[PDB]
Design a protein around this ligand. Sequence first.
Ligand SMILES: O=C(CCC(F)(F)F)N1CCC2(CC1)CC(c1ccccc1)=NO2
Ligand SMILES: O=C(CCC(F)(F)F)N1CCC2(CC1)CC(c1ccccc1)=NO2
Lengths: 190, 186
Amino acid sequence: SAATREALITGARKLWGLRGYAEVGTPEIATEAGVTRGAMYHQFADKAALFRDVVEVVEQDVMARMATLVAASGAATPADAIRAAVDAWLEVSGDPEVRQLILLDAPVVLGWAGFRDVAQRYSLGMTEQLITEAIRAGQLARQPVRPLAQVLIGALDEAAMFIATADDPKRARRETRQVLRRLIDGMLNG
Amino acid sequence: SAATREALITGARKLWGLRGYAEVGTPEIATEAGVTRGAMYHQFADKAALFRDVVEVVEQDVMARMATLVAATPADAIRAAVDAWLEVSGDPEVRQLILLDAPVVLGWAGFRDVAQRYSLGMTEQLITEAIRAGQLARQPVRPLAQVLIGALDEAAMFIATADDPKRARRETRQVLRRLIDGMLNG
Ligand SMILES: O=C(CCC(F)(F)F)N1CCC2(CC1)CC(c1ccccc1)=NO2
Ligand SMILES: O=C(CCC(F)(F)F)N1CCC2(CC1)CC(c1ccccc1)=NO2
């Protein structure tokens, strides 16, 4: 039953990641997972409840992958870490599974309140940390941390959404990246 | 029947603006508007369809109010547009219908679609003129517009639900002024 929970999250994540929430039902997910409908329904009351758990694990991975790519950049100063985090988010957003589940399905299925709540829970802390360190190093002017975090999260989430539905995503990714890099380079002292 | 549409949009806008979408039903709106439920349902199949039309009219007005406040260099217009948006988003009716109810009722796809349809043109124009005047580096116009709209919408949402909106408006204003002053040349 713990095993059943895990198999259901993994199967849902894989299938919904490829085909989207709308295109795969709970019976096909149960078959994929090798469990009965009665065991599925004991763990998840409906389609949407399984999807909320798929979103948590995917967002968990998005954040761990973000932290990995910033560490991998070899950013010495906070300013460079900030530059590396921007690039990392555009990299990770571009992953087809992240695009489908987080950018496209999640806002529709969780609704706005649910989606914002999740997106804040996973993003705010990293965002505030990067800012706080840049301020401590003197690479960013002292200013209210939470409001700047919030503004950057809005800018970066919107970037990702814009690329996700672009006629030409490779162009939109490059252009949006340049525009973010310029904005950041005008804010940062170093 | 255009008249019935107008009466219904005004009544909806007034009542939902005071009490919020969730707290007022369509029958009370029909009574407010001076029409029968049958005439309302001929024009709007449900609650949400009336709300989409309330959003259009309100956003139309938000944009005209924005253009009015700016017209009262391109770089300064950009700074004035930021102030103007914080001014007009602070309006209780705009706060309730556009910042709070619209993303819930339209969804994010619908909300972004509306917000871009009304905002993009002004946003692209301000950018383009700042580029022409040499106050902003030449760079892709649509992607910058898009990023600014996201930042500014999120600013307004942050203020709209702040524990202390007067504090959050001042702090967020400073943070937006800094962001903008880094985007602009001088
Ligand atoms: O998980 C999300 C969003 C999930 C969504 F559901 F809303 F779409 N992220 C966006 C913002 C972050 C974290 C990843 C923070 C960040 C950063 C970069 C530079 C300086 C400060 C923060 N890069 O991306
Ligand atoms: O209509 C909206 C949002 C409506 C909502 F539905 F999303 F809530 N606005 C935000 C963007 C604008 C217009 C107001 C454009 C703008 C600006 C400022 C500086 C340089 C360039 C553009 N400031 O506010």
